[PDB]
């Protein structure tokens, strides 16, 4: 490509009618497969977070499961640790949990009770912002641990699903937007 | 690196009776939470791979889902891309899938080209059923799986014997 953003944008692959007829799926797989594209993606997110919070972030919180692909790498780039917010049942020890809407039904996310001490400043990371269901659940869980969620970031945002407005008061950032 | 390995081992947390009674769960969560520990883990894996394969690796393959935590970072450290092996139904487009004792894994049709050399990564190696199924899927794309690597191996479950002739490497071992 050329610029870093187009190095990422050219690696987001479109699949119409997946998983259901009418929708257009955005596949982030080529970004991970091309090391130059992955590097560019992490760098863009890292520079945004460094410029925005001035190095004053305590942890990245990565979302099960595609957020796991970006969370640790972004954390490492910023010199920060990464905490995990997982689907219900995946984490050992005492947990807090929260429900959210998934397709035609309901699901739950969880976090370990000792994942954070009170007052930690945290950025939530996932690959794609759609309905905002999981990010909303994530913010609720972090709040119960008395964390300060600085913002939610993703590579892709699907604007027609209005995920960003649901996250308020928490600000959202995304590298790329489609419907 | 004894000091680096200690940084990883100190962070591994064990929980008795999870997910079921009698089973000891090895939790790699604190490794991710401590940036120095995460750096150490990625560095140890990368150094092993370079000391064993040099630059003769094309891709890292990360396993859904805990393998996703280490795959990209390890690939990045080696200057390599990362391909995904997911639970069935997650990936768009043409796919190859398979079952194992049931559980199902899947890969995209164009994930790799014939002869390309891959290292598989997951957080923990137990019976080896998961990693073996990943290897078999990759085999159906005519990839050469050089090795499977993980942070932890549970030695008494004989995962490496299941993986053979694909070699397995782990930073830490427990019964
Ligand atoms: N005692 C354990 N502690 C943490 N993860 C485990 C444990 N036993 C099996 N797993 C998970 O099971 C998968 C591999 O198991 P296997 O296919 O039997 O080699 C990986 O996702 C592992 O993290």
Report the C-alpha gap between B67 and B93 in whole angstroms. Answer: 22
Report the C-alpha gap between A152 and A73 in whole angstroms. Answer: 16
Integer CA distances (angstroms), A143 to A40, A74, A121, in order:
31, 22, 11
Largest CA distance in chain B: 45
What is chain B's alpha carbon radius of gyration, rounded to the nearest angstrom? 16
Integer CA distances (angstroms), B104 to B14, B112, B130, in order:
28, 19, 9
> What is the Å distance from ligand 1's center to B25 Cα?
8
The residue from A4, A9, A66, A77 that is catalytic is A66
Other Cβ atoms closer than 10 A to B93: 13
Burial of B94 (0-12, 13-18, 19+ CB in 10 A): exposed
Closest-CA distance, B161 to chain A, in angstroms, reads 27
Enumerate the domain spans of chain A: 1-179
Contact between A26 and A128 (Cβ < 8 Å): yes
Report the C-alpha gap between B51 and B58 in whole angstroms. Answer: 15
Bridge-based pairing state of the strands A105-112 and A81-87: antiparallel
Taking the Cβ of residue A75 and every Cβ of chain B, the question of whether any pair is shorter than 8 Å is answered with yes
Integer CA distances (angstroms), A152 to A16, A63, A105, A113, B29, in order:
27, 11, 24, 21, 21
What is chain A's alpha carbon radius of gyration, rounded to the nearest angstrom? 16
Q: Which two tokens stand for residue B175?
A: 């019964």
Residues with Cβ within 6 A of ligand 1? B 23-26, 66, 122-131, 154, 159
| Nearest in space to A125 (alpha carbons), one of A168, A161, A175, A179 | A175
How many Cα atoms within 13 Å fall on the side-chain side of residue A119? Answer: 0
Taking the Cβ of residue B91 and every Cβ of chain A, the question of whether any pair is shorter than 8 Å is answered with yes
Question: Domain A1-179, CATH 3.30.230.10 — does that match?
Answer: no
Integer CA distances (angstroms), A19 to A26, A75, B35, in order:
11, 31, 36
In the numeric block, the tokens 């889902």 are attached to: B65
Report the C-alpha gap between A154 and A61 in whole angstroms. Answer: 12
Contact between B173 and B157 (Cβ < 8 Å): no
Largest CA distance in chain A: 48
B83/A32 Cβ within 8 A: yes
Residues 6+ apart with CB under 8 A from A9: A1, A176
DSSP secondary structure letters along A44-57: HHHHHHHHHHTT--
| Nearest in space to A79 (alpha carbons), one of A48, A57, A52 | A57
Other Cβ atoms closer than 10 A to A60: 28
Bridge-based pairing state of the strands B168-174 and B144-154: parallel
Q: Which two tokens stand for residue B173?
A: 């071992």
> Could you confirm whether A103 is annotated as catalytic?
yes
Which class in CATH covers the domain with range B1-175? Answer: alpha beta
In the numeric block, the tokens 């059923």 are attached to: B129
Contact between A111 and A84 (Cβ < 8 Å): yes
Report the C-alpha gap between A172 and A129 in whole angstroms. Answer: 9
Burial of A5 (0-12, 13-18, 19+ CB in 10 A): middle
Other Cβ atoms closer than 10 A to A72: 29
Q: Which two tokens stand for residue B105?
A: 């894994």
In the numeric block, the tokens 């609720």 are attached to: A140
Q: Which two tokens stand for residue B38?
A: 């995460």
Residues of B in contact with A34 (CB under 8 A): 81
Q: Which of B34, B83, B84 sits opposite A81 (nearest CB)?
A: B34
The SS3 assignment for B22 reads: coil
Other Cβ atoms closer than 10 A to B167: 13
Give the phi and the psi of residue A60 in degrees, each rounded to 5: -95, 140
Taking the Cβ of residue B93 and every Cβ of chain A, the question of whether any pair is shorter than 8 Å is answered with yes
Report the C-alpha gap between B163 and B168 in whole angstroms. Answer: 7
Report the C-alpha gap between B48 and B171 in whole angstroms. Answer: 9
């Amino acid at each position: 490509a050329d610029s870093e953003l187009q190095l990422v944008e050219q690696r987001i692959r479109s699949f119409p009618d997946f998983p259901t007829p009418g929708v257009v799926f955005r596949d982030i797989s080529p970004v991970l497969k091309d090391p130059a594209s992955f590097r560019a993606a992490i760098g863009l997110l890292a520079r945004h977070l460094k410029a925005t919070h001035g190095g004053r972030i305590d942890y990245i919180a990565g979302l099960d499961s595609r957020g796991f692909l970006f969370g640790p790498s972004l954390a490492q780039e910023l010199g920060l640790g990464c905490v995990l917010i997982r689907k219900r049942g995946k984490l050992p020890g005492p947990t807090l949990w929260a429900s959210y809407s998934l397709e035609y039904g309901k699901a739950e996310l969880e976090i370990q009770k000792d994942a954070l001490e009170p007052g930690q400043r945290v950025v939530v990371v996932d690959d794609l912002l759609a309905t905002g269901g999981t990010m909303n659940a994530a913010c609720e869980l972090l709040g119960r641990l008395q964390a300060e969620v600085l913002e939610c970031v993703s590579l892709v945002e699907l604007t027609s699903l209005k995920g960003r407005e649901k996250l308020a008061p928490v600000p959202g950032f995304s590298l790329l937007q489609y419907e």
